Structures are given as C-alpha cells and as structure tokens.
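Q: A reviewer asked whether we had any structural model of the full assembly, not just the individual parts. We don't, so I'm hoping you can provide one. Inputs are below.
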Amino acid sequence: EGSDDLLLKLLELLVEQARVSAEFARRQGDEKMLEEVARKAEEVARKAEEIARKARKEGNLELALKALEILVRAAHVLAEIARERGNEELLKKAWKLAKEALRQVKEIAEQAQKEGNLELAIIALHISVRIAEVLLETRPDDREEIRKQQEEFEELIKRLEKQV
Amino acid sequence: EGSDDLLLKLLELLVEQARVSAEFARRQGDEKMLEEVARKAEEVARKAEEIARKARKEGNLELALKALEILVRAAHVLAEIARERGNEELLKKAWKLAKEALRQVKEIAEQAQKEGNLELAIIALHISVRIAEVLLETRPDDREEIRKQQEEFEELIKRLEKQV
Amino acid sequence: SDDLLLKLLELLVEQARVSAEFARRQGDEKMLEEVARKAEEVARKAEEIARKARKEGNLELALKALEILVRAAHVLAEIARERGNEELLKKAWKLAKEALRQVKEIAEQAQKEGNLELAIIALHISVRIAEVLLETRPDDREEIRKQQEEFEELIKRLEKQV
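A: Here is a predicted structure for the entire assembly that you could use as a starting point for your response.
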C-alpha cells in the first residue's frame, strides 16, 4: 500500500535520526535523552513488526521484507544505544527483536524459495545476515541462536544454487 | 539535465578517491598530498554547491538534493582529513559547509512538501541526518546547531506523518 | 543466469564476514580457515564470470563480477589483518592486484568508446580496490601512485566528454 510504503520510509528516517541523537546524548552525559531515543527505536521496531505481520498475512512478501529491514535496523540502533548506555535490559530488548526478525525472515525466505522467487529469497537472506550482526552485538554467547541463522542460511543457499 | 547528473557522479568519484588518498597520505606522512587532497575536497564542495543553487533556481529540486548529498560527503571527507592532521581550521571549514548544506536542505524540504512531493521531502530529511553526523565530527560542542537540526527534523517529519 | 549467480556470491561474501566474527569470538581457527577458503572460492568464481563477460563484450556484467571479487578480497583482508595472518593478507593483495588490472582496462575501453556510465562504475571499483591495497600492502607506494594517476587521468577525460 502507498500508505505503508510511506510510513516505512518515515520509520527508517526516525531510526537514522535516533542513531545520531544518541551519539550526541552520550557525549553530553544526557542519560534522559538516551532513554528517550531508546524508547523511540523500540517504538519504531514495534510499528515495523506490525506492518510486516499484516503484510505477511495478507500475502505481500515484498512489503513484509521492507518492514523487516527496518525492524532489524531499529534493533541494531537499539543495541548501539544499549552499548552507549551500558544497559543490559536494552541489550536484551534488542536481542528479542532480532530473534523475532530471524523467525519471520526465515519463513519468508522458505516461502519465496518454494515458490521460486529467487530474488525475494535473496533479499530475505540478506536481512538474516544483518540479523546475525545484531545477534553478535547483543548476545554473542548464545551460540544456539547464531547457529540457527547459519544453518538456515546454509540450508537455503545450497537450494538456491541448484536453481541457477 | 543528464549532463549535470553525470557531473555530480564525477564529483562523487573525486570525493571517494580523496578519502582513500588521504588515508595513504597520512600513513606516509605526506603532508603535501594531505594538503592537495584537502583542497581537492574543497573544490568539489564548491562545485556541488554551484550545481545545487542553479538546480534550485531552475526548479529541479531532485538535482539540487543530489548535489547537496555530494556537498555533505565532501564535508565529511574534509572533516576526516582535518581530525587526522589535527587541523582546527580545516574542521571549521567542514563545519561551515555542513551549516550551509543544512540551510539549503531545510528550504528544499519545505518546498518539496509545499508542492506535495513527499519523496523529495524524505530525501531531504535523509541528507539532514547525514549533516548532523558531520556536525558531530566537526563541532560537537555547538549544541545550538544540532538542536536546530533535531527541531527541524521533528517538525517536518510530524507534518509528513499526517499524510499517511 | 550470471546476474542471479552474482547475487548469490555477494550473499556468501556478506555471510563470510559475519561468520568470521563469530569464529574469532569462539576461538575456532578451523572455522576461520573455512570462511577464508569460501571467500577465496567466491573470488575465483567472480573472476571466471568477469573473464567470460568480457570475452562477449558484456562490460556491465564484467564490472558486476569484479565488484564481488573486490568485496571478497576485502573480506579476506579483514580476516587476515585481524588475525595477523600475513599469508592470507598476501592472497587478498593478489586478488586486488588482479582486479585493478581488469578494472583499469575496462575503464579505458569504456571511456574511449564513450560509455560514460560504465566508465564511472569502473572508477568506483578502482576506489574500492585502493582501499583493499591499503589494508594488504600499505607500504607499496608505487601501486597506489599508479592507481591515482590512472584515476585522475580518466576523470579529466570524462569531464570533457560530459
């Protein structure tokens, strides 16, 4: 929908602005602004999850991956803010978002690969790469969640290789 | 204008090459190359600024935003060169370029939504976030200029949210 | 087609960089060796596609494959420089050297023929190669000089042709 594509573009801008605003707040020792920026990233991740959920349910796999790319970017910014704050609760929140994204991206990737949409499955696998980067930043000692991305990536890329 | 579009692509290449050339010049202790790269980045910023003004005059807002993106990238490269060589005056010139780009981006961003062109208003806000990053690298203690960018960002994006 | 295969090789390059970070975190030197070999394999397949695409005169496709060859060499250099592995840092330098020779040739051909868009893409890859040369052989003043003369001489020609 034209309304949801516009909303996702604005959500991405809020994520970019939150990243720079957190850098300034960290330099100033403004922990209150750091908490407001963190809540901004959480709010964007919540809305992006909404859109990806409705899009995947209504069959729009392309809109779902656009919303998931923003969800992952918001979780990455939230993990950065958690590092700036030295706050493990914010780090746990970003890790939960990365898990939610990995499960949805995996489902969309299998759906696109089953239907033979190679480009859509490639875009999904690209987001799962960015998800693994967030997992490394948040909880790198949870080898189960990281191996799950590596297995789902390895099992699918070999299938896509056969169809080319 | 296809000619001005290709010209900006060439200016984009000169900025990217200036960035890497500055890294080598710093490694070899070649202050002669470090000075040549710095003014090369300055000449690109002025040329991108000229194209931006002419594009804005002709009513081509998309071309003006492409030129300003080059101007900001040139200012960032200048800031990286300056903070490397420890030159406060080169940092000041890069700050000045960022402040001028911010003023032009804010004008285009309102003119874009005044014509109902939400996509160009979104691109302008993208550039303003890149400008805020340059302000962080040049004068982080100029709290008024960054607060000015955040207020303009919030005011405009809230207007665009009302169109979803 | 070669377009879809290149998109797959690029995905393998992205996963290799993240898999190498986890391998270093876990201290698995055997996994680091496997990731480096997969990056080396992607670089070789990209060079194959570049040579084929150039033989048919499909310069657009050749530059897409050379872009991936440079990204593969860039990932290799990061693994080598992080581990301090001088051996892998030399193999990445050889891939960058090979890419710059092919990129410069396509950049000259495109500029002579007037394909301004393809010449710009080639010059963009040349900048990415100079970055890899910084990571692998920073003290080699000559290769970077030649990259800089080739770059500025080709830019000047394109400014006139635009």
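A: Points you may want to mention in the reply: The helical segments of chain C are 2-26, 29-55, 59-83, 86-113, 116-136, 141-161. Chain C touches chain A through 15 residues (CB under 8 Å).
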